[PDB]
Amino acid sequence: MRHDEYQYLDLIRQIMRTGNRKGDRTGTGTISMFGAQMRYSLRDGIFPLLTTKRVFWRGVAEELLWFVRGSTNAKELQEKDIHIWDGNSSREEGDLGPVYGFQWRHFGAPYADMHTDYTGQGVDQLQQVIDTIKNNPDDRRIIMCAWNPVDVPKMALPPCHCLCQFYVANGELSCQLYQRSADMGLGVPFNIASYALLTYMIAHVTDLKPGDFVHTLGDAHVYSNHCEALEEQLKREPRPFPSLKIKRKVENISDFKFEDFELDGYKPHPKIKMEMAV
Amino acid sequence: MRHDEYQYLDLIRQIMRTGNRKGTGTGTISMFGAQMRYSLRDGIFPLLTTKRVFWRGVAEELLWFVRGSTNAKELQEKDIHIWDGNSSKEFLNKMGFHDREEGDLGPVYGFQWRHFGAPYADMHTDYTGQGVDQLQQVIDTIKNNPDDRRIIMCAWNPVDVPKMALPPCHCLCQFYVANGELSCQLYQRSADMGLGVPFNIASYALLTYMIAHVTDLKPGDFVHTLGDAHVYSNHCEALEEQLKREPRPFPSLKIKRKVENISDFKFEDFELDGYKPHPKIKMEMA
């Protein structure tokens, strides 16, 4: 019965107390461990939006709807006051290259720019996953992969979220994410919520109930200048997770809109300032 | 410090007790999401001891991957038959590969590791200079930028899976350097706990030993992450017998000479000392 958020807190504590101090691409220096795994229940409307520091729910949901549209145009997020892709995007202003939206919907197609019509090009992995869940739920290849060795050099930033896999049992849809690089302080809470939300959406349109989100980490790290803030965060007790309901019968994965999500009872501790490494 | 092999034994035990019973025609008992960690340090090599594992098959299959080969006949010539089932002309014709010759597994590991993105023709084609040589890329990044968080080799290729005799169970692996030590994490989407997993552990441990050697590092950990981790129902009696066996200290592995490039290893370069396993247990492949 231990709150699932303690998996996240325990890993931060372990990284700071036992991790490897190294340099890194950004020049900030990090403290890191290699290889971790967390499991978050998604059952009975439970939505694992972390509570010991406020997470950017609106950014999570808008970014994911943008992925689902297949968009690689950061201007569509900026227009919605979502600036999480700003650092890496000024090729035309806003064109992120063949990032998630494109890999999920067009893996293997040649990329031109964010305005190109890629209909019928590449593998639409997202629809492939939905079809397999509906038609052959015991399949062990229900995978969506964003790590494309051909395209990584054209991407504004190599994907941290290399691939995810789905699994069906007990009337439940589960999802596992392989995240190669995990900034425990800033990105990880958002990343948990992203793939928990994707699982809620796919479960909804496949007539399944959400089960578990399994979060596997490669290089799991704390930036050296985050330790003071995270030591303060570790003093905070998690609060019960919010609940998530989808307010209408959405027929297909592409039909979701932001207002379809009813997030109830989110009561996080206040935000903590933490500068993002560049 | 408990023997690392107990992670495998404990997971088999857990799956058989609480795993999900689901539906080939053989039943599976499965869990989703698991992770084991095997130390590779101080010459220790995690070749499981509660059932004799096919070490020579592990090493020859891995050398075959590294050559970029997708031709199962090259394994057969060395009396390694682990891919025979998936490459008979009859199997391939059954899968719809009517123009494919016996032995041709399609664009599987050797090809994805050395030529990701190239068009696949057949197993005899000269692919030199085509596609992404991910294996050499990893070696170069380890040498030149060891703190890089993108040291990845990916065999999961959505474009090519329809041409493969079997989609890769070993989707991708990632490397990590700290304190002079090279670690490796494998994401395995599908794990036959009884038959494939022991062999798969030894494969990626050996790969880590080889890459560490040619990058002048020491092996650290092998982290084995599983997606659908399952026990086939007709393995349960055999695995119940294995669970009563106590692990013995793992063997040691040394590389007998200085090998400069990953492509230069031969089986005789490996010295596996002290492997004293319990006997094989028959488990029929689904």
Ligand SMILES: Cc1nc(=O)c2cc(CN(C)c3ccc(C(=O)N[C@@H](CCC(=O)O)C(=O)O)s3)ccc2[nH]1
């Ligand atoms: C070093 C680094 N760490 C990261 O975690 C990271 C994450 C993203 C993308 N991403 C997945 C993000 C999620 C949340 C973000 C953010 O800036 N949130 C702040 C402020 C909230 C807001 O932007 O309004 C926060 O909530 O802490 S950015 C891009 C570059 C990165 N760079």
Ligand SMILES: Cc1nc(=O)c2cc(CN(C)c3ccc(C(=O)N[C@@H](CCC(=O)O)C(=O)O)s3)ccc2[nH]1
């Ligand atoms: C259902 C299935 N499970 C697997 O684990 C599997 C593994 C491979 C390839 N592979 C990675 C293998 C490793 C070991 C193997 C095997 O057949 N083992 C023998 C014992 C070793 C020997 O051949 O001497 C066995 O127990 O039958 S096969 C191919 C198809 C598969 N199919």
Ligand SMILES: O=c1ccn([C@H]2C[C@H](O)[C@@H](COP(=O)(O)O)O2)c(=O)[nH]1
């Ligand atoms: O969704 C995201 C995007 C990025 N990062 C973090 C991980 C690293 O700290 C940095 C990306 O840098 P590289 O791993 O690519 O160097 O941002 C995340 O945690 N989650």
Ligand SMILES: O=c1ccn([C@H]2C[C@H](O)[C@@H](COP(=O)(O)O)O2)c(=O)[nH]1
């Ligand atoms: O090296 C390998 C190759 C295959 N498998 C097992 C996993 C599954 O039981 C089966 C592959 O079947 P699918 O998951 O593709 O259905 O073989 C392994 O465990 N290891």
